[PDB]
């Protein structure tokens, strides 16, 4: 036993269970699978703009109470995300602005659009977040599509398109795909679509005025910057009763408990021996990440501000993206920020660089004027063929393993515990989530070794 316990993946959610066993006085070990630190919380401060740049996570949420206290006991300040003006909606092609957040009552979508947010977050409320798989009426559920649903309970094809929209770049998935019973699921452990979607407040609330991999480096300078090894990537895990002995092809380790930080997907790329009970081999088997990509371009003002608008904006057919603005008062020009996520992606990735490019432009111009035609920077971020993440932004499942193996997201095996977001209770998804999920799985050792 070289350490007492070894985490698998430097992400908030690895980092935030290796400083918690470390201050709790356990001899601790992260293993990385590449060269950095961060995980779907990538930062680069040397950004070829003016300001250090996001390229994976980066929204801090009012009620993400556990990383903002880790992130700012580990000296980070935060910093505003929402911005004055009015939010964008591109319905059909059609550009509506949204004085407060609100659409003109008079639409004749509007209506329905307030009614099926209402009756989603009522499914949600019916599943909550501890036993969705054992809710009610679980089974029903997991056995319908988001997409199916949504066609059974809307009638307008734009209120029925903003949906899905919403799912696309909410989930890295399009609601064809998604089980109905983890669509509600999600919706509730994130504390309702209102808070899932806002733009001001809610989960997209604020940023770490510096970058947000810095959770994680900051962690790691604190803990012994010699305790993370970088490009360490584990294959094989033997997990037996008295420890558990990882492998990084002929190189190996052993701790007496490790605890695995990481997608399910990714997790079910190591081999285990002996296997793994049926149930977490299915869900990590069957649990795959979203498509997505994240763009961001760069100019000399904040034009859209300036204009009247928030850089909000939320587009259904144009090209299928969630828009958002990400100008922090440190940096030196302004940045606009768009997602594009599950069949959008999808549609995007089949074009080339540039024609991605263009259309992102375009769609900008004929939200925020002509400004928008030439930026000083232009960076996007495919995220689906990521060696590592191999996906989108969330991990999501389609009909038939929530409702039967959603517990295997958490229960740990023998030594093996499971951490990364997607085992939090809530906030699975989310930083939040990751920092949560890696404390409690921290919790959870710790009592082990106190016997
Ligand atoms: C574009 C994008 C934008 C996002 N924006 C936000 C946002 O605004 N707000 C928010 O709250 N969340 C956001 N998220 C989600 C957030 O990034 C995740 O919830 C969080 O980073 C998950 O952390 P994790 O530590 O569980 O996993 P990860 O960050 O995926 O880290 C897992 C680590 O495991 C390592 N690893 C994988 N396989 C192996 C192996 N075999 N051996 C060794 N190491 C391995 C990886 O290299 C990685 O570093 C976003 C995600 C994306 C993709």
Same mark, same amino acid.
């Given at each position: ?387 590592? *993440? ?5 991990? +999501? @499942?389609?009909? %038939? $393993?929530? !409702?039967?193996?959603? =517990? /295997? ?13 997607? *085992? ?5 998804? +989310? @930083?939040?989530? %990751? $920092?949560? !999920?890696?404390?409690? =799985? /921290? ?9």
């Amino acid at each position: 036993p070289d350490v007492d316990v070894i985490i698998i993946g430097a992400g908030i959610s690895g980092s935030a269970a290796a400083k918690a066993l470390h201050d709790q006085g356990a001899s601790v070990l992260v293993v990385e699978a590449n060269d950095r630190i961060g995980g779907r919380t990538w930062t680069e401060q040397e950004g070829a703009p003016g300001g250090p740049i996001d390229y994976g996570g980066m929204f801090i949420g009012e009620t993400h109470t556990h990383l903002i206290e880790l992130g700012t006991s580990l000296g980070l300040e935060m910093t505003p995300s929402g911005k004055p003006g009015d939010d964008t909606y591109i319905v059909a092609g059609n550009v509506l602005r949204a004085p407060d957040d609100q659409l003109d009552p008079n639409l004749p979508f509007v209506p329905e659009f307030l009614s099926s947010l209402k009756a989603l977050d009522e499914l949600a409320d019916s599943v909550g977040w501890d036993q969705p798989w054992a809710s009610p009426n679980a089974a029903a559920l997991d056995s319908k599509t988001v997409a199916t649903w949504l066609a059974e309970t809307i009638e307008s094809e734009e209120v029925r398109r903003l949906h899905t929209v919403i799912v696309n770049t909410l989930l890295g998935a399009d609601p064809y795909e998604v089980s109905l019973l983890y669509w509600a699921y999600y919706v509730s452990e994130c504390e309702g679509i209102q808070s899932l979607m806002g733009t001001r407040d809610g989960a997209q609330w604020a940023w770490w005025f510096g970058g947000a991999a810095q959770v994680s480096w900051r962690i790691a300078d604190a803990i012994g910057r010699d305790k993370f090894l970088l490009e360490w990537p584990v294959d094989r895990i033997e997990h037996d009763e008295s420890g558990v002995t990882l492998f990084s092809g002929q190189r190996s380790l052993r701790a007496r408990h490790i605890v695995i930080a990481m997608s399910p997907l990714a997790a079910n790329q190591i081999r285990f021996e002996p296997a793994l009970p049926t149930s977490r081999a299915q869900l990590q088997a069957r649990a795959p990440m979203g498509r997505y990509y994240k763009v961001q371009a760069r100019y000399p003002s904040s034009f859209w501000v300036e204009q009247g608008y928030s850089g909000a904006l939320l587009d259904t057919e144009d090209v299928g993206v969630f828009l958002l603005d990400g100008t922090k008062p440190t940096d030196t020009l302004a940045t606009l920020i768009g997602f594009i996520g599950g069949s959008n992606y999808d549609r995007w990735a089949a074009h080339t660089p540039q024609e991605r490019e263009r259309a992102f432009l375009d769609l900008l111009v004929k939200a925020f004027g002509p400004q928008a035609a030439d930026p000083s920077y232009f960076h996007e971020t495919d995220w689906t063929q990521q060696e590592w *993440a191999k996906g989108g932004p969330v991990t +999501y @499942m389609p009909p %038939g $393993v929530l !409702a039967n193996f959603g =517990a /295997a997201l958490r229960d740990p095996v023998g030594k093996v515990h499971f951490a990364g977001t997607e *085992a939090s209770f809530q906030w699975s998804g +989310y @930083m939040e989530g %990751g $920092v949560r !999920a890696g404390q409690k =799985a /921290a919790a959870a050792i710790a009592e082990e070794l106190e016997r």
